[PDB]
């Protein structure tokens with residue numbers, strides 16, 4: 001059906017690239033496919049979708065979705081800050097680089113020893129803090145994504161719960177590196193494995209349930 | 215006209231990805247399209263082509279070409295040295311990372327409150343120079359032409375890089391797609407080790423690959 005009519009959705013997808021010079025960057029391996037799928041499913045179910053996309057596995061701009069393209073984490077933060085006021089739902093599915101090189105050259109570096117790094121802003125935490133300080137009165141659902149693994153410091157669910165708690169978002173989509181939907185009300189739903197489209201359907205369903213209650 | 219019939223060519227294309235941990239890497243913005251086009255033109259003109267491809271997931275495999283996929287500069291080095299002894303022509307079109315992180319983490323590196331450590335770096339082996347070295351030392355008897363690529367922002371550094379690497383032909387500034395609003399530097403050259411410089415018109419990747427292969431074919435029959 002069209003159970004998302006009127007809802008303005010802001011989605012981020014793909015990995016960011018943190019330049020060292022015009023040709024080299026620090027990047028990550030995320031394809032952006034899962035975020036695109038959520039944007040497509042949101043748009044199909046009646047939402048006005050803006051998709052902020054970084055580096056993608058040659059993906060095609062989805063139909064009927066406003067596209068914003070970005071390169072680095074800082075440009076993603078600016079674009080989200082730009083469009084966040086008009087959004088009812090923020091879906092932070094982008095793999096945002098946690099650091100950027102301390103210096104960026106305008107011309108290719110030629111033939112060095114060490115790259116100094118500086119921390120990037122947490123865009124998801126910024127949206128959570130802004131909504132709680134009354135600056136995003138239109139925002140009804142903030143969704144983060146996380147890939148978690150168990151290790152010597154804790155099982156996978158322990159780490160996923162700690163992330164939900166630290167971020168403070170309404171829903172945390174957890175991929176167990178299948179996974180979970182962790183809500184801010186404590187509910188914990190297993191996310192059955194399937195294609196990127198099928199898992200997007202379950203995510204959007206979860207967003208819909210959290211909106212129809214609020 | 216199969217002017218490359220009976221020629222076995224090994225082509226490298228794409229950028230390498232130097233891992234920091236399982237999900238992060240140092241990479242570069244090379245698409246690999248120019249090397250794919252050289253590989254395609256070689257096969258279209260009769261060559262038996264093996265293509266060693268880096269970060270090029272979005273590109274179509276050229277028809278008639280054997281694909282070898284690699285990730286890092288070190289995997290490209292091992293693949294070239296494995297396949298070079300069977301080739302007659304080596305076309306080094308890959309944007310090979312000059313450096314790699316000195317330690318690759320086993321787990322995803324977690325952000326802390328601590329100040330970020332730097333990324334310590336170490337040089338990767340010069341794969342093109344390793345091939346030239348191996349030929350000079352008698353290990354590549356079948357090798358008839360080693361082709362390197364270079365970007366220099368021009369003829370001072372192009373002729374200089376030519377003699378530092380020691381290859382047979384240097385393609386300089388075969389960049390761009392003649393795309394709207396990309397500045398045409400008029401920087402393209404084909405430099406031969408035998409003393410020939412030819413201007414590379416900055417057109418499509420295909421017209422450039424055609425010019426590159428024309429030069430390889432004229433260099434081979436020169437022998």
Ligand SMILES: Nc1ccn([C@@H]2O[C@H](COP(=O)(O)OP(=O)(O)OP(=O)(O)O)[C@@H](O)[C@H]2O)c(=O)n1
Nearest residue numbers: 092094096121122123124144145146147324325
């Ligand atoms: N600078 C950042 C980093 C991440 N995120 C968002 O925060 C969520 C969680 O990202 P994750 O990588 O799991 O968490 P971090 O808190 O960055 O921690 P770590 O990498 O140490 O696990 C994702 O939806 C991501 O889009 C963000 O908004 N800004």
Ligand SMILES: Nc1ccn([C@@H]2O[C@H](COP(=O)(O)OP(=O)(O)OP(=O)(O)O)[C@@H](O)[C@H]2O)c(=O)n1
Nearest residue numbers: 110111306308310312338339340341342362363
């Ligand atoms: N580790 C490397 C680096 C480069 N190359 C090859 O060398 C040629 C020229 O690369 P170049 O840009 O000259 O790299 P460097 O010699 O390190 O110089 P620069 O600092 O300008 O990049 C290309 O054909 C490339 O495939 C290589 O085989 N192995």
Ligand SMILES: O=C(c1ccc(O)cc1)c1ccc(O)c(O)c1O
Nearest residue numbers: 018026097098099100234323332333
């Ligand atoms: O944490 C690192 C990192 C630091 C040192 C190292 O040897 C390997 C990785 C990092 C660097 C750049 C970046 O963009 C990023 O997100 C990162 O997490």
Ligand SMILES: O=C(c1ccc(O)cc1)c1ccc(O)c(O)c1O
Nearest residue numbers: 020109112115232240311312313314
């Ligand atoms: O040239 C650099 C470089 C050096 C210092 C700096 O601040 C930024 C970039 C480089 C770094 C990492 C890498 O993997 C690589 O191949 C490289 O050529």
Ligand SMILES: O=C(c1ccc(O)cc1)c1ccc(O)c(O)c1O
Nearest residue numbers: 291294295298339340341344345348
């Ligand atoms: O560069 C090469 C190399 C490149 C091409 C070729 O045909 C043969 C060797 C190399 C290979 C292995 C190694 O250990 C090394 O240090 C190296 O420099």
Ligand SMILES: [Ca+2]
Nearest residue numbers: 096097098325
């Ligand atoms: Ca992170």
Ligand SMILES: [Ca+2]
Nearest residue numbers: 309310311312
């Ligand atoms: Ca180089």
